[PDB]
Amino acid sequence: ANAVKTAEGVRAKIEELKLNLPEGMEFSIPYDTAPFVKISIEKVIHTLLEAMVLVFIVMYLFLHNVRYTLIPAIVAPIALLGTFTVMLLAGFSINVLTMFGMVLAIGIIVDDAIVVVENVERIMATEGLSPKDATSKAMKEITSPIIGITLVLAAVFLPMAFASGSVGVIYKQFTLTMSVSILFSALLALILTPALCATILKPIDGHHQKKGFFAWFDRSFDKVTKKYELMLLKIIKHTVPMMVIFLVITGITFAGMKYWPTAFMPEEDQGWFMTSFQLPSDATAERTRNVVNQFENNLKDNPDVKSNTAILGWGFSGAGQNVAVAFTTLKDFKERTSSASKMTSDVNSSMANSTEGETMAVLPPAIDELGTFSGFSLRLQDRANLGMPALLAAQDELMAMAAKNKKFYMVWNEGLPQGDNISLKIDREKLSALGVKFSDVSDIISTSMGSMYINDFPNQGRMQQVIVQVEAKSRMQLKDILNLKVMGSSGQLVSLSEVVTPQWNKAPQQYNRYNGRPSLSIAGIPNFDTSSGEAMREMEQLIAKLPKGIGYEWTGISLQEKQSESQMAFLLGLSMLVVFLVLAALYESWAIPLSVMLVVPLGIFGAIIAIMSRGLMNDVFFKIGLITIIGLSAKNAILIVEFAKMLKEEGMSLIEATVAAAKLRLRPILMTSLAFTCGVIPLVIATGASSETQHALGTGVFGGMISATILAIFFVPVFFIFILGAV
């Protein structure tokens, strides 16, 4: 079903019931979530439209004429409009994960058309040649990169689509939206852009009066591409001490990817949180109301709070009299100071001193139907018949260690605690000695505390119930049950206190179960400046100190997080093995596709640097960024080493070939690179609601593409000389 659409038909249906309401009844919706669902999706669409115009600006800063820029500008929507049909025929949808896959795609679907319009900009300016004959001489040179660049970049997202778990569904939304968008832009770079460039371009001759702010950009660019050749010609002399830096760069990343903390999904501010109360086991509901009323008077004077509903007597994970839950909704973001993760801490400090029970304000989960709250879920189950009192005595061993670890912050248990019972023992022999029938003792106890539903009766157009229960003043103490009287055989009444004997004991009030085993459901939130996987591994250290026979398991968000961490080394293995195979099919050798697999860690090197300077984690959005860099940094390698190998077989040696091949393609490499770099600027500097889920996806590909291109254009001419220069 749909969140924003079912919430509106309810909002419509209430608006017709305003008419038949009596005087003195008003509707109210003090808790809704679909306000956040609508705000978050237009924040992604507004991110995509700012992503288009920033790509359109840097294409205008390089080609200096607006008719050139519209030729790869219009292949962006038709490639995206062609992907919306494929989503429909495959059963996909429009969510934030698919449209994040289009924000990533905007920088790369222009790349296959940037090379074409750039290449006719040379030939129309170098030889002074007419644009119809200029396009055919351009297309006879660059058809082989784009048919290689497309297959090398459409094939990196296919091994990650076949993962398992909930991370496999997150990778699919990024697979289908980013693979067939470049596949649609491939033909639209070969079919459509030569048709435009042969017609809508009139021959540009040399501006005898060349002027403007753009005129400094063209003269300085021929100063830079003169400066780039002099620096490149220096380092191929020193090609053996340039390789020894490359082992050092790979070594920081192989330790940086293994020692940095991991998580699953960054948690956001959704404008509401949720408090949960748990009094002891014999608290009546008058005692729960006094705890909630103290919680209410601490939120009457915070300015940030719109509403706070409370449901006494019911909560997630158990219902009883000693149970409540509160939904508390904040104002919208521009008015609010003191965002939500600070406000849950102020609840958890003023409600730990006075209010008789466990009060825990938590934040809403990342994914809706994976849990009730953000944190980790543990199922402390016993596996060999140890009995319930041993298992309950096993958790407060575990609950004592986790109160002193600084990698935790209030680990607790979800469910009703233990309590007292009263059991009566009927003395049969005495009962038969007084002539008291046992049948009359056993039903003055049965119909003494429960309610009895008899039949129905019509109450002004509806059949309601008729319920019989004992009066409220005679089922409160134990001594009101021990003064019910039953008739003997002699003729006078015998009270129940003579024939029964009450005895107290202590037994659990809730019998959970998990995978066929008795269990307890332990929860917990990790500490400030400590990730999820750090706290998830120190919990399974402290489980190994328990009495023997007590197992454990992960459930909910945590089981899908541990499953996501075992597959990364395999999905990064295949995604590098596939491109090495498909490059040998194109470049017809084994040595040349080794010169592309050395540029792969030069972009991973910037991916971990940009995290540590910003303090994010290693989550599923970073791993989407890694497979992006594997394909995209190979792209900047493929443009150089393809034109180098062709130049060598036409009659050049190895050293003079790669100098010319890197010089003649500096302009397309810088064009596509910083278009992708400026294509993820609105992912890095987002501000408002749903900002944190954009910071995770964007800062990995930002520093990864900067450290690719600034390192690639000095390193693939080092690798290509050294690998083919063996013998």
Partner 1 sequence: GATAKTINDSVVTLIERELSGVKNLLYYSATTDTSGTAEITATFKPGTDVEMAQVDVQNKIKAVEARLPQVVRQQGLQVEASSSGFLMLVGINSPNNQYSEVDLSDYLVRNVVEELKRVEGVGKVQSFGAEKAMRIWVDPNKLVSYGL
Partner 2 sequence: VEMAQVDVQNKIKAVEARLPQVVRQQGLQVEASSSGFLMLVGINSPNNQYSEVDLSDYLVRNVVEELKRVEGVGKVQSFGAEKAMRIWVDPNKLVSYGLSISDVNNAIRENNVEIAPGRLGDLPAEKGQLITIPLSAQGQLSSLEQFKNISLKSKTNGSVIKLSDVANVEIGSQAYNFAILENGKPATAAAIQLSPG
Least distance from C-beta 708 to partner 1, angstroms? 33
272-311: contacts with partner 2 (CB under 8 A): 282-287
The option from partner 1, partner 2, ligand PTY, none interacting with 553 (CB < 5 to 8 A, set by class) reads partner 1
Do strands 452-458 and 305-312 pair parallel, antiparallel, or not at all (unpaired)?
unpaired
d(CA 283, CA 355): 12
The nearer residue to ligand PTY, 181 or 693, going by C-beta atoms, is: 181
423 binds partner 2 (CB under 8 A): yes
Q: Say if residue 677 is exposed, middle or buried (CB neighbours under 10 Å; 0-12, 13-18, 19+).
A: buried
CA-derived radius of gyration, the chain: 35
Buried b (16+ CB within 10 A) or exposed e, 483-515: ebebebeeeeebebeebbeeeeeeebeeebebe
Stretch that binds partner 1, among 507-515, 573-581, 593-601, 674-682 (CB under 8 A): 507-515
Q: Are 22 and 631 in contact (CB under 8 A)?
A: no
* Count of Cβ atoms closer than 10 Å to residue 60 Cβ: 16
Q: Give, as ranges, the residues between 147 and 186 that touch partner 1 (CB under 8 A).
A: 165-166, 168-169
Give me the least distance between CB of 108 and ligand PTY, in Å please.
16
Residues from 137 through 176 that contact ligand PTY (CB under 6 A): 161-162, 172
Q: Is residue 93 part of the contact set for partner 1 (CB under 8 A)?
A: no
The position carrying tokens 């991991």 is: 262
Rounded Cα gap, residues 266 and 590, in angstroms: 41
Binding positions for ligand PTY, 468-487, rule CB under 6 A: none
Stretch near ligand PTY under the rule CB under 6 A, chosen from 181-189, 291-299, 466-474, 709-717: 181-189
CA distances to 169, 199, 566, 567, 570 from 163, in Å: 8, 46, 11, 8, 10
Is residue 291 within 8 Å of 279, Cβ to Cβ? yes
CB nearer ligand PTY, residue 512 or residue 567: 567
> Per-residue x/- mask for ligand PTY, residues 490 to 529, rule CB under 6 A?
----------------------------------------
* Closest separation in Å from C-beta 472 to partner 2: 5
Tell me the CB-side half-sphere exposure of residue 477, using CA atoms within 13 A: 5
Applying the rule CB under 8 A, the residues between 535 and 564 that interact with partner 1 are 553, 555, 559
Half-sphere exposure of 250 (CA within 13 A, CB side): 10
Q: Which of residues 477-496 bind partner 2 (CB under 8 A)?
A: 477-478, 481
Q: Binder to partner 1 among 209, 459, 490, 492 (CB under 8 A)? A: 459
Residues 595-624 within binding reach of partner 2 (CB under 8 A)? none
Q: Is 323 in the site for partner 2 (CB under 8 A)?
A: no
Tell me how far apart the alpha carbons of residues 442 and 425 are, in angstroms, rounded to a whole number. Answer: 12
In the list partner 1, partner 2, ligand PTY, none, the entry touching 477 (Cβ below 5 to 8 angstroms by class) is: partner 2
Cβ neighbours of 178 (radius 10 Å): 27
Give the nearest distance from C-beta 416 to partner 2 in angstroms.
Answer: 12
Give me the residue label for tokens 């009995």.
387
**What's the min distance (Å) between Cβ of 316 and partner 1?**
8
Nearest to 693 by CA among 374, 368, 366, 370: 366
CA distances from 575 to 13, 97, 271, 440, 634 (A): 51, 21, 39, 78, 12
Region from 38-46, 311-319, 523-531, 645-653 binding partner 1, contact rule CB under 8 A: 311-319
Q: Which of residues 435-454 bind partner 2 (CB under 8 A)?
A: 437-439, 442, 445-446, 448-450
Does position 446 interact with ligand PTY (CB under 6 A)? The reply is: no
Q: Which residue's CB atom is positioned nearest to ligand PTY?
A: 90
Does position 505 bind partner 2 by CB under 8 A? Answer: no
For partner 2, the closer of residues 35 and 415 by Cβ is 415
425 part of the interface to partner 2, by CB under 8 A: yes
Stretch that binds partner 2, among 139-147, 190-198, 432-440, 550-558 (CB under 8 A): 432-440
Partner from ligand PTY, partner 2, partner 1, none binding residue 338, C-beta < 5-8 Å depending on class: none
Q: What is the torsional sign of CA 129, 132, 133, 135? A: positive
Q: Which of residues 67-96 bind ligand PTY (CB under 6 A)?
A: 82, 85-86, 89-90
* Joined tokens for residue 408: 């935790």
Report the alpha-carbon distance of residue 510 to residue 508 in Å, rounded: 6
Judged by CB under 8 A, the residue of 485, 489, 502, 506 near partner 1 is: 485
Does residue 57 bind partner 1 (CB under 8 A)? no
Please, what is the minimum distance in Å from the beta carbon of residue 278 to partner 1? 12
Between strands 376-381 and 513-514, the pairing is unpaired
Q: Name 618's bridge partners.
A: 262
3-state secondary structure of 311: strand
CB 275 within 8 A of CB 359: yes
| Residue 426 touches which member of partner 1, partner 2, ligand PTY, none, C-beta under 5-8 Å by kind | partner 2
User: Does 447 engage in binding with ligand PTY (CB under 6 A)?
Assistant: no
Instruction: Considering the complex, state which of residue 83 and residue 521 has its C-beta at the smaller distance from ligand PTY.
Output: 83
Quick check: 664 and 643 in contact, CB under 8 A? yes
Which residues lie below 8 Å from residue 561, measured CB to CB, with a gap of 6+?
263, 264, 532, 533, 536, 554
- Residue 470: both structure tokens together: 């004992």
Please name which of 414, 421, 615, 441 lies closest in space to residue 522, comparing C-alpha atoms. Answer: 414
Residues lying near ligand PTY in the complex (CB under 6 A) are found at 82, 85-86, 89-90, 161-162, 172, 180, 183-184, 186-187
Residues lying near partner 2 in the complex (CB under 8 A) are found at 282-287, 313, 321, 419-426, 432, 437-439, 442, 445-446, 448-450, 469, 472-473, 475-478, 481, 500, 516
